[PDB]
Design a protein around this ligand. Structure first.
Ligand code: CMP
Length: 1051
């Protein structure tokens, strides 16, 4: 008639809602009172027949549809909630701990059950009991570990051990369930090891295959969220169902691998789809847990509680104690092996993970499967009663005492920098609330509002609210503006000032890294590496953030460059030629290859079975595909040395002669013919799929190298940008001079080393580096366009729907950018000469510079630029990396920069010396050609204006970053603000300039200016002070006074 199942599911939803709402403050989890409510519902169902009808329709469910409905959701959410980078960083330890602890804990619990329980269980049923018992589902422990500050890696350790524990526990449970409940099978040794191999490898391989197909499908979906959600759900359920039923493999491990790969590659999912998928899968797992606990309670009080004794409760208590003891001995036994890992466990983490073994819904569902499979036997009832009791006892006692245990062991204390940061944030929020309240007290609409309720509601308080001696010492090392006492430093006081300066540097570097993350410049994993290295340097005595510990991020070496180099070596290569030159023949032979492949596998199948003489041997295999299209028209009639020298063409010659042997065997037309036909087809397929397969492996290897190079470039850029900002802010926090000099020296040598190593990193792999730089440039342009769209929307100049269309356009472009070519070929030096910032617009000027350019090759160690020598040319680095030594500033100039602007402009001997750190090719425009180019052009953007604008940007950027370092704008914002401005001509201004209030900054780039009604004649190029009202300029020959301002933006 009508479904009672929807009534039970909605009732479980409402009961879970009341359970979650009413038990927020209590430390008892909502699952235990869900079990209590399920037991109450089961006993009224045993009394009242209508509730008996509802519970008999739902809770007396088949074991199979119980597994295939609830298990994929729980397993996929456990895999998808993971921090997969931290899990993969400690994957060996988690894998060995979970796997070996599962095996030895299952046999120990099995031996315990056989030696302790009165029931005459055999060895296999006892491993089934141990497999149910050792499956752990801690969620409250991982929530407490994520919430309570430090030991963040221990929660990932516990979660990964739990996920692999659940997967392999259901695997060993299914193995012994098939052993016990269905004992009709008798097997040999070979079939048994084939079954073990099939389960163990064909779980993860099937999961890997469906995960790769799903990632490929999700990479090619734009502007449709609902389809992405449906393929995630359908891929999970289809992977589990096809693996468990059709392939007869372990489907739990397939969903584990699929969830780990989908959580690993989260970038082809759109971010709103990603956050909805996280919330949606958490909601689905909550639904599964609530339903599972309610049916567990119902069948426990209906059938599992009809056969219990006092000895059963005693066995439950001894089983709980021995399960905790067994897990403790497992961890204590594997402690040295787990200790010789890069994240070794302490005694506190071992005790926490011992007590964090909370048995959950997975073992309860397996106990339901055992109960329904056993039938009227008491084995399922005993399994169900002991599993429910172990779950209840572990949940209650372990949860309350794990909160208490985290309190006592000293892993719940808030750290002093976190406490100071939270106190400062709370004080800032309080000051802002007071200022907003004083604003709202003098507003005409809101003056009459009662303010007692306003201060009662809007009151943020701080959550945190030998240690005293340490805090007193840390406050004692503070020679700041709090106290005004002049003195002379002491050597011990110098040691404390050294330490305080070093911690202030590392703390400011952590703020630099978080500022880089919040502005969409750093990656998240790069941020975690830089912050981790900063805090590791902070925990040591004198160790700064070194470069050797940062080089491991961009260590490109490994399996993948060796694979790339060897596959490049295999496919390096070297009238009738032109049709081969079009390359459209090769795709036709490849499609012909696959259309040859599949039906000869069918003919293999039909002689394995051994109709109309099998279709007359399938028209003699289409006369062997018309003898391979007459051997590709006799290889287009024997194209000479091009066919002669290629070993690939040598085995196509082998193919054609073996096909001629197939002709003479058809002429002979027994057993030798079939085996040789087998060898023909298998060889043909494998060595002709190899030519298609090798470039696909080349792109896969290039993608892996691209990911590693992107991480390394992101880490290096984060260190360099943070080191720039910290070296620009360091003057305020450090008062001593020699301390400042030492700190600047280490900062500069680290900066130079990282810039050099990134330059040689670009030199090593050209195409991959060009690909990651193109990807980062497109991402930066798209992010700033999205910010422009948001600022146009927030200013009211664009309505909501049209702004949403523009954001959808840039988001679709970003998703296309995620599916990029992994190795863009490097551009020619003509293209790099074309794309120069002072040479972008004018095409005629591009033709003149190409007519006047000479490529000049230099070896290692030659000098390009001499300081004493007069300026005779311009240089453009098209490849290679150069060093600079100048009077002392040291920098390394990369590909696409220009060397010599002020030399060719203001006619002075060169300021620096440039040498080659690798072999370099530069474009040399001789100075007389620069002068005839500078004369022959009179457009509104002129080369004189463009070159002076490029150099004006370069000098003005760190000088503006000096003043705004207190304000905290990054270098990118300074460059974007300065990019808005233009050089202003004094010839139109009659050599008198006025400063306006509208002008944000005024920087003179070159020359001497008079200021403030001849108050002082400023010779040094710098930012013109706002105190200066106007500047009057004087003509001096070859002085050429250039000032570069920006105006404020107008809506
Ligand atoms: N502070 C700097 N940062 C980057 N490049 C510089 C710096 N100073 C000089 N250069 C470059 O080094 C070149 C040396 O010779 P030039 O002075 O003709 O032009 C100079 C600039 O191109």
């Amino acid at each position: 008639h009508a479904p009672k199942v929807i009534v039970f599911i909605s009732g479980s939803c409402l009961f879970g809602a009341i359970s979650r709402s009413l038990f927020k403050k209590l430390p008892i989890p909502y699952t235990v009172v869900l079990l209590i409510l399920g037991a109450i519902l089961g006993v009224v169902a045993s009394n009242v027949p209508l509730v008996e009808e509802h519970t008999r329709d739902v809770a007396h469910m088949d074991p199979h549809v119980l597994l295939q409905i609830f298990l994929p959701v729980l397993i996929f959410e456990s895999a998808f909630a993971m921090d997969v980078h931290t899990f993969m960083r400690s994957f060996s330890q988690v894998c060995i701990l979970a796997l070996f602890g599962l095996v030895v804990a299952s046999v120990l619990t099995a031996v315990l059950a056989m030696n302790l329980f009165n029931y005459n269980w055999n060895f296999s049923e006892a491993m089934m009991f141990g497999a149910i018992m050792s499956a752990t589902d801690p969620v409250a422990v991982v929530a407490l570990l994520k919430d309570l500050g430090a030991s963040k890696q221990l929660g990932t350790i516990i979660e990964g051990e739990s996920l692999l524990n659940d997967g392999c526990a259901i695997v060993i449970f299914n193995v012994f369930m098939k052993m016990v409940f269905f004992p009709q099978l008798t097997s040999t040794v070979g079939q048994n090891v084939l079954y073990f191999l099939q389960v163990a490898v064909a779980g993860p391989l099937w999961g890997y295959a469906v995960a790769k197909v799903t990632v490929f499908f999700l990479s090619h979906i734009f502007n449709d969220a609902l389809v992405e959600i449906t393929i995630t759900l359908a891929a999970t359920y289809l992977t589990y169902y096809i693996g468990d039923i059709w392939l007869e493999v372990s489907g739990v491990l397939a969903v584990v691998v699929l969830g780990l790969i989908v959580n690993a590659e989260k970038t082809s999912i759109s971010p709103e789809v990603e956050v909805f998928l996280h919330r949606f899968w958490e909601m689905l797992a909550y639904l599964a847990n609530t339903l599972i606990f309610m049916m567990v309670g119902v069948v426990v009080t209906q059938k599992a509680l009809v056969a219990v004794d006092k000895m059963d409760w005693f066995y439950l208590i001894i089983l709980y104690l021995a399960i905790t003891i067994i897990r403790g001995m497992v961890i204590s036994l594997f402690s040295p092996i787990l200790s010789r890992i890069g994240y070794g466990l302490t005694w506190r983490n071992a005790v926490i993970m011992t007590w964090g073994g909370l048995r959950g819904a997975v073992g309860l569902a397996l106990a339901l499967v055992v109960e329904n499979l056993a039938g009227n036997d008491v084995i399922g009832s005993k399994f169900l009663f002991h599993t429910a009791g172990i779950v209840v006892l572990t949940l209650v006692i372990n949860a309350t005492t794990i909160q208490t245990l985290l309190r006592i062991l000293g892993m719940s204390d808030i750290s002093i920098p976190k406490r100071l940061a939270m106190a400062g944030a709370v004080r800032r929020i309080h000051e802002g609330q007071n200022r907003t309240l004083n604003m709202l007290k003098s507003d005409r609409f809101l003056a009459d509002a009662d303010w007692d309720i306003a201060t009662a509601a809007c009151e943020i308080s701080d959550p945190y609210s030998a240690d005293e001696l340490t805090l007193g010492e840390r406050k004692s090392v503070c020679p700041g503006c709090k106290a005004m006492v002049p003195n002379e430093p002491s050597p011990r006081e110098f040691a404390d000032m050294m330490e305080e300066a070093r911690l202030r540097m590392l703390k400011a570097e952590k703020i630099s890294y978080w500022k880089q993350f919040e502005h969409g410049m750093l990656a998240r994993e790069a941020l975690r590496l830089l912050v981790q290295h900063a805090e590791v340097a902070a925990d040591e005595k004198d160790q700064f953030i070194l470069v050797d510990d940062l080089k491991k991020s961009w260590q490109i070496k490994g399996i993948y460059p060796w694979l790339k180099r060897k596959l490049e070596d295999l496919i390096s290569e070297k009238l009738m030629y032109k049709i081969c030159h079009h390359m459209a023949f090769e795709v036709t032979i490849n499609i012909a290859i696959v259309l040859n492949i599949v039906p000869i596998i069918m003919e293999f199948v039909v002689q394995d079975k051994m109709q109309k003489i099998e279709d007359a041997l399938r028209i003699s295999n289409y006369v062997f595909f018309v003898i391979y299209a007459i051997e590709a028209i006799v290889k287009i009639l024997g194209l000479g040395r091009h066919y002669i020298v290629s070993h690939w063409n040598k085995f196509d010659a082998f193919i054609l002669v073996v096909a001629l042997v197939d002709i003479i065997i058809a002429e002979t037309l027994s057993s030798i013919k079939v085996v040789k036909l087998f060898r023909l087809l298998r060889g043909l397929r494998m060595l002709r799929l190899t030519k298609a397969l090798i470039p696909k492996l080349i792109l896969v290897v290039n993608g892996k190298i691209n990911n590693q190079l992107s991480l390394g470039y992101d880490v290096g850029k984060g260190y360099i940008i943070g080191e720039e900002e910290v070296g620009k802010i360091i003057d305020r926090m450090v008062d001593n001079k020699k301390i400042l000099r030492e700190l600047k020296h280490i900062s500069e040598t680290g900066r130079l080393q990282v810039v050099k190593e990134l330059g040689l990193l670009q030199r090593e792999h050209p195409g991959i580096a060009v690909s990651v730089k193109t990807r980062q440039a497109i991402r930066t342009i798209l992010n700033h366009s999205r910010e422009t769209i948001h600022e146009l929307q927030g200013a009211g100049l664009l309505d909501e729907m049209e702004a949403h269309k523009l954001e959808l356009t840039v988001e679709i472009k970003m998703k296309r950018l995620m599916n990029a070519p992994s190795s863009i070929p490097p551009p020619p030096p003509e293209n790099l000469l074309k794309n120069v910032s002072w040479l972008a617009g004018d095409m005629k000027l591009i033709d003149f510079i190409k007519a006047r350019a000479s490529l000049l090759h230099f070896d290692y160690g030659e000098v390009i630029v001499r300081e004493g020598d007069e300026s005779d040319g311009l240089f453009l680095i098209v490849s290679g990396l150069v060093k600079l030594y100048g009077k002392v500033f040291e920098d390394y100039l990369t590909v696409g920069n220009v060397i010599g602007e002020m030399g060719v402009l203001t006619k002075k001997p060169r300021n620096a010396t440039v040498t080659c750190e690798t072999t370099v090719q530069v474009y040399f425009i001789t100075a007389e050609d620069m002068n005839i180019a500078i004369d022959t052009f009179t457009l509104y953007p002129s080369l004189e204006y463009r070159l002076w604008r490029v150099v004006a940007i370069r000098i003005a950027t760190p000088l503006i970053m000096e003043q705004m370092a207190f304000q905290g704008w990054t270098q990118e914002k300074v460059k974007l603000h300065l990019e808005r401005g233009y050089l202003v001509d004094l010839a139109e201004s009659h050599f008198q300039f006025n400063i306006d209030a509208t002008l944000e900054d005024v920087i003179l780039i070159n020359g001497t200016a008079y200021n403030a009604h001849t108050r002082e004649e400023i010779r040094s190029p710098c930012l013109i002070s706002r105190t200066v009202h106007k500047l009057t300029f004087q003509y001096t020959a070859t002085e050429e006074p250039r000032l570069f301002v920006v105006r404020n933006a107008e809506y």
